[PDB]
Write a protein that binds this DNA or RNA. Structure first.
Ligand SMILES: [Mg+2]
Ligand SMILES: [Mg+2]
Ligand SMILES: [Mg+2]
Ligand SMILES: [Mg+2]
Ligand SMILES: [Mg+2]
Ligand SMILES: [Zn+2]
Lengths: 130, 52, 45, 243, 47, 78, 132
RNA sequence: CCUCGCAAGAGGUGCACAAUCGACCGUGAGUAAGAGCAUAGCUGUUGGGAGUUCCUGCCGAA
């Protein structure tokens, strides 16, 4: 049913979709790795999916499988990426072993950017402590 | 009882649930399959090489 | 395309009893027909 | 009565219920009453097991559960039955009904599986073939067992070539079978000698004749016939095993 | 703990792609030889 | 006289001289949709946003490293 | 004529996608023919009754062929004896479906036929009379 | 669509429909294996009293 769901979401109301002036579309979905409404992008469209998303200081990895499509409360499995960037990429590749290259590449890029953002918000909010 | 099942009358006079034009919702499963790829000729590059 | 659904008690605890899915949920999901019928019926009020 | 309960428990959202259904199945399967049952109970049980696989979460649990489904075939073996007589035992007939139900249910549900959900079931078919052949090895390939297994199980639907059978299952088994026999039989120089000798012991040359017949028939699909002819007849191990 | 196993579809795809690549390489070699012979024929016709 | 022949190249269409496509932003959640596309896109705070919200949007944008097309608007003039 | 079905039906579009892919990637002209048929309007998709299926099978050597109708199949009470075959078509009326099931035949969607016969082997396409 | 053929072809089989050839019913609208009904959209004509035309593009007589 993923194709049907995607086609309805495409030619009907993807509520998280925002139509930019260029004509490109952006899904507002927080779990979305690539914030662009496409076949590979909407977590709604695709049963198999993954994302790096920041919670507190941690940069967790969220996993989505067709097996837990029912029971959406427990759908997203939460994995802690190690603070070491190399270890984090290794863990992402391991968990995303035998996993389509699109989500893996996008997940790695999102982890890099979130790490940079965490570094730079530490920068902007440096305090006298320590 | 209100709408009916495979072997149960819908309780609406002369009503049956609609049939599916396509038996499978997901076209990716069907297009991939196992036998089609045996039937299919080798693929192209998917990004045409510019000639001339 | 599950076989059955699990009833849930009001307090929240999952109930052992399970009910098979009806045949309605395995029916065509047609945005176009729903859209046309919805426009026609919403014009009434 | 119990069979319906097992089918329901297997098709339960709670993981614990699904696991406990399978654990109790391991005990229920090795009983006289199950043997007495008709093929329809077998088919219902296989539907329940199929849905149990349908709910498996992650690839490692999927491997574990495919191994468990193989073990289910592995259970229906008595060392005594092999020794007593060459003629097949009623336990073995029950095992043949078990395999029949498996392949009927898999043929039925093959088409409804999702794209992402199909990969686990390919592994399941692999492990089921492994366990079914391991049963023949444990029985030492009795002629009666082999004949009735081929005619009742493999000839019925996996290798029937009928239009009803989805062609993907034939391509899948022909990919599986070559590696599966090698799995049963277990440097490369001496390893090949051991494999060759144990292959001479095995009846696989009997099995390949079915694919030969399928390739012979005109009514069968050209896609299936062509792939089988290209994969098997051109294979090297058949030459190595003089087949 | 236990190692993950390759998907059973990716293995089929790898087999098919390997066979296709071998076929394409053979066709390429034959095409190269045919091109040389074709150039010889063209030279003769032009003369 | 306007006509289709004057149409701009697709690769350069809808591009500011800074090289960033303008994307309207209302709140922090809509800002976060442009987290990595900092090179391709630049945010533009909507006209109807209150001054109290604009400073929060600017702070979050600086943290994310996304270029804002109209900062110091309603916090400064022109 | 058309390059895509004027209908906005999701499932017809899915079938068109599958069949255009097969026609692109299959040498057999069957996929091309069915792809072009899928675009046709209602007037250009006349109903092919179970009656015509019976005649098409009575033709010599076609008894075991898979009859294909890009469109709908309608029942015909005029007949008493109907042979067993695995008709394939877009839609099946309740009468036609009951007749096919009763006589040991079976009805499949065009996707199931594509899985069966990606090159259209042993297929027999039929088209209804478009008198008006 | 099936076989043979690397291919051109050799055939086999034949949807719709056409071509002529005829039978029967009653010389055609013929039969000898029907498609229509309903809804909605666009839209041609007949009508009942009954100047220019937001921007761009497209197809195009004489
Ligand atoms: Mg590519
Ligand atoms: Mg390939
Ligand atoms: Mg203003
Ligand atoms: Mg009409
Ligand atoms: Mg004739
Ligand atoms: Zn979307």
């Amino acid at each position: 049913s993923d194709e049907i769901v995607w086609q309805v979401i495409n030619q009907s109301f993807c509520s998280h979709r925002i139509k930019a002036p260029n004509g490109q579309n952006f899904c507002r979905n927080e779990y979305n790795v690539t914030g662009l409404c496409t076949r590979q992008s909407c977590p709604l469209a695709n049963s198999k999916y993954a994302t790096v998303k920041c919670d507190n200081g941690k940069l967790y990895l969220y996993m989505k499988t067709p097996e837990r499509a029912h029971t959406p409360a427990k759908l997203w499995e939460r994995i802690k990426l190690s603070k070491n960037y190399t270890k984090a990429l290794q863990q992402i590749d391991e968990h995303l072993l035998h996993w389509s290259k699109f989500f893996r590449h996008k997940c790695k890029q999102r982890f890099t950017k979130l790490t940079q953002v965490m570094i730079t918000e530490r920068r902007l909010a440096l305090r006298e402590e320590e | 009882q209100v709408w009916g099942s495979e072997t149960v009358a819908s309780s609406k006079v002369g009503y049956t649930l609609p049939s599916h034009i396509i038996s499978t919702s997901d076209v990716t499963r069907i297009i991939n399959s196992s036998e089609i790829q045996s039937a299919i000729r080798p693929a192209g590059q998917a990004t045409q090489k510019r000639t001339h | 395309s599950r076989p059955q659904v699990t009833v849930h008690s009001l307090t929240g605890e999952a109930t052992a009893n399970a009910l098979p899915l009806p045949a309605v949920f395995s029916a065509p999901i047609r945005p176009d027909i729903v859209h046309t019928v919805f426009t026609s019926v919403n014009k009434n009020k | 009565m119990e069979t319906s309960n097992f089918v329901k428990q297997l098709s339960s959202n709670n993981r614990k219920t699904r696991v406990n259904a399978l654990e109790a199945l391991k005990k229920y399967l090795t009983a006289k009453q199950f043997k007495e049952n008709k093929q329809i109970e077998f088919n219902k049980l296989w539907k329940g097991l199929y849905y149990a696989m349908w709910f498996s979460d992650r690839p490692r649990p999927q491997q574990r559960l495919a191994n468990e489904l193989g073990e289910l075939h592995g259970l229906y073996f008595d060392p005594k039955d092999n020794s007593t007589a060459d003629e097949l035992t009623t336990n073995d007939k029950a095992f043949i009904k078990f395999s029949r139900g498996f392949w009927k249910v898999m043929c039925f549900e093959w088409f409804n599986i999702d794209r992402y959900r199909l990969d686990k079931y390919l592994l399941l078919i692999r492990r089921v073939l492994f366990s079914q052949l391991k049963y023949l090895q444990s029985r030492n390939w009795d002629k009666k067992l082999v004949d009735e297994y081929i005619k009742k199980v493999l000839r019925w639907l996996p290798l029937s070539g009928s239009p009803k059978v989805y062609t993907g299952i034939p391509i899948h088994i022909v990919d599986i079978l070559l590696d599966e026999w090698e799995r049963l039989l277990k440097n490369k120089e001496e390893e090949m000698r051991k494999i060759a000798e144990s292959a001479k012991k095995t009846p696989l040359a009997d099995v390949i004749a079915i694919f030969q017949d399928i390739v012979a028939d005109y009514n069968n699909s050209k896609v299936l016939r062509e792939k089988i002819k290209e994969d098997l007849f051109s294979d090297t191990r058949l030459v190595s095993w003089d087949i | 703990a236990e190692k993950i196993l390759t998907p059973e579809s990716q293995l089929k795809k790898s087999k098919a792609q390997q066979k296709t690549a071998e076929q394409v390489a053979a066709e390429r070699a034959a095409r190269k030889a045919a091109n040389k012979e074709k150039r010889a024929i063209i030279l003769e016709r032009n003369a | 006289q306007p006509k289709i022949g004057y149409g701009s190249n697709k690769k350069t269409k809808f591009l500011s001289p800074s090289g960033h496509k303008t994307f309207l932003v209302a709140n922090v959640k809509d800002l976060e949709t442009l987290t990595m596309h900092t090179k391709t896109y630049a945010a533009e705070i909507a006209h109807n946003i209150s001054a109290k919200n604009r400073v929060v949007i600017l702070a979050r944008a600086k943290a994310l490293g996304i270029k804002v097309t109209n900062p110091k608007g309603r916090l400064a003039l022109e | 004529h058309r390059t895509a079905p004027k209908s906005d039906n999701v499932y017809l579009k899915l079938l068109v996608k599958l069949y255009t892919f097969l026609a692109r990637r299959t040498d057999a002209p069957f996929n091309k023919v069915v792809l072009k048929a899928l675009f046709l309007s209602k007037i250009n998709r006349p109903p092919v009754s179970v009656s015509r299926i019976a005649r098409a099978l009575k033709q010599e050597g076609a008894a075991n062929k898979t009859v294909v109708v890009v469109g709908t199949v309608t029942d015909d009470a005029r007949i008493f004896e109907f042979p067993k075959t695995t008709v394939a078509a877009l839609r099946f009326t309740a009468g036609a479906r009951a007749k096919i099931v009763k006589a040991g035949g079976e009805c499949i969607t065009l996707d199931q036929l594509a899985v069966r016969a990606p090159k259209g082997q042993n297929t027999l396409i039929l088209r209804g009379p478009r008198n008006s």
